[PDB]
Amino acid sequence: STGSATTTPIDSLDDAYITPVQIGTPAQTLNLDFDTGSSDLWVFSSETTASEVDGQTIYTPSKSTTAKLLSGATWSISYGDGSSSSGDVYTDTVSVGGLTVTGQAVESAKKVSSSFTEDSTIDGLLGLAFSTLNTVSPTQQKTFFDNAKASLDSPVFTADLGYHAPGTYNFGFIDTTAYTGSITYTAVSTKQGFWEWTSTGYAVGSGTFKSTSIDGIADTGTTLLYLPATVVSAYWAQVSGAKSSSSVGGYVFPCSATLPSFTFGVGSARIVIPGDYIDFGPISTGSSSCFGGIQSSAGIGINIFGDVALKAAFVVFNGATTPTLGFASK
Numbered sequence: 249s250t251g252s253a254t255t256t257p258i259d260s261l262d263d264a265y266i267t268p269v270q271i272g273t274p275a276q277t278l279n280l281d282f283d284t285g286s287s288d289l290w291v292f293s294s295e296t297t298a299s300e301v302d303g304q305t306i307y308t309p310s311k312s313t314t315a316k317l318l319s320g321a322t323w324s325i326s327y328g329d330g331s332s333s334s335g336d337v338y339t340d341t342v343s344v345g346g347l348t349v350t351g352q353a354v355e356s357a358k359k360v361s362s363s364f365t366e367d368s369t370i371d372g373l374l375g376l377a378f379s380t381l382n383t384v385s386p387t388q389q390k391t392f393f394d395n396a397k398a399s400l401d402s403p404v405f406t407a408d409l410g411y412h413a414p415g416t417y418n419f420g421f422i423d424t425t426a427y428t429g430s431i432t433y434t435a436v437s438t439k440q441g442f443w444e445w446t447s448t449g450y451a452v453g454s455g456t457f458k459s460t461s462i463d464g465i466a467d468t469g470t471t472l473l474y475l476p477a478t479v480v481s482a483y484w485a486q487v488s489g490a491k492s493s494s495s496v497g498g499y500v501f502p503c504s505a506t507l508p509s510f511t512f513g514v515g516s517a518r519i520v521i522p523g524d525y526i527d528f529g530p531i532s533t534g535s536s537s538c539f540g541g542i543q544s545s546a547g548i549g550i551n552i553f554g555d556v557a558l559k560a561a562f563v564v565f566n567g568a569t570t571p572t573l574g575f576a577s578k
């Protein structure tokens with residue numbers, strides 16, 4: 249089997265992407281944030297504290313003929329941005345882009361933090377990291393990908409995120425029309441439960457490529473590119489007037505600037521992020537200070553190849569016995 253679903257930016261900045269997901273019988277379609285940096289499929293629901301729901305579409309298990317309470321199971325998750333959610337668990341039928349899994353754990357939120365409530369466009373998360381990170385207790389649950397894998401034509405999914413435009417998540421096949429040149433595959437460590445890999449270096453604009461190992465994770469659920477402070481300083485030093493602002497919480501730059509591109513290495517291959525991808529616009533409405541899309545990881549504990557980086561590539565998440573990542577230009 250295969251599946252193919254379109255993923256759409258939630259706003260004009262590409263702050264996250266939402267993908268429609270069918271849950272239950274008859275189908276309830278919710279727009280979920282596919283997150284290769286976490287491993288829980290959780291939704292706004294009929295159980296979510298009413299004051300914490302503001303415009304989201306909810307899953308109502310009582311209206312699904314295939315929903316089962318997963319008795320005794322609870323979940324609770326905290327993300328790298330400080331947001332959180334928790335609740336109880338149902339199993340139900342879940343379909344993405346025509347690919348169906350029966351018996352998927354659907355984590356129903358009883359509580360969500362303010363950033364979730366305030367974002368009416370995201371009805372929940374669909375985690376695509378390794379199932380070792382799933383938070384359900386006392387019986388850990390599998391991701392949608394892990395449950396689908398044995399049915400798939402090839403044990404893979406691909407992320408093809410758009411810049412200011414829709415893109416695609418495919419499951420079970422690699423669309424050879426969706427990229428240019430060849431795919432370069434690189435090793436993955438699953439030790440921390442992430443799609444963790446090592447980039448071979450970077451370049452800023454037209455500058456020389458610096459060969460250097462940068463461990464990090466491929467994370468579709470993180471908006472920006474978080475890299476070591478040395479790398480980030482080298483990038484923003486090429487933008488007149490850019491500076492790190494502790495009041496704003498990272499690098500800012502004059503909105504009048506033209507940003508240089510940023511290149512990262514994948515083995516002997518190179519992925520180029522156009523400068524435009526690194527502009528996240530005015531810090532507050534009407535400001536002439538703009539927020540940068542490349543930020544320091546130093547206060548995180550891991551480097552994160554988030555959407556800024558991933559959207560410049562066609563990315564293969566190879567879930568074979570030995571997992572690998574692939575990157576192609578597009």
Ligand code: NA
Pocket residue numbers: none
């Ligand atoms: Na922000």
